[PDB]
């Protein structure tokens, strides 16, 4: 009975790990969107025909 | 007849022994529930993800 009652702490630890994972994935897809915009801006700046101002 | 009369003291002694075992098992029930709560507390406190306050 004590061993069965002890599982609630394991459940709470798995809850907290799922929450930390969720916050990490939210930051992660935000960072992926930002990285895609970075690659677009870098390729847009790569060409030599641009003026100094747009560069 | 004297030996037959003597049984009452043995009966009273076994009565006191049963009473002492009863109070001991009541304390044991409390101590076992308390030890199970201690297991849950230490098991929840094993986490490395906890903040210092909950620890």
For B49, which of A2, A5, A17 is closest by C-beta distance?
A17
Cβ contact, residue pair B35, A2, below 8 Å? yes
> In sequence order, what DSSP letters do the residues of A8-30 get, joined into one string?
HHHHHHHHHHHHHHHHHHHHHHH
Nearest to A45 by CA among A54, A36, A35: A54
Resolution in A: 2.5
B49 and A17 in contact (C-beta within 8 Å)?
Answer: yes
**Structure solved via:** cryo-EM
Distance, CA of B34 to CA of B40 (rounded, Å): 10
Give B37 to chain A, closest Cα distance, Å: 8
B49 and A16 in contact (C-beta within 8 Å)?
Answer: yes
């Amino acid at each position: 009975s004590a061993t069965a009652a002890s599982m609630n702490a394991v459940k709470d630890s798995l809850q907290r790990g799922q929450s930390t994972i969720d916050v990490a994935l939210a930051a992660g897809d935000t960072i992926t969107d930002l990285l895609g915009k970075m690659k677009e801006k870098a390729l847009a700046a790569s060409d030599t025909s641009l003026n100094t101002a747009s560069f």
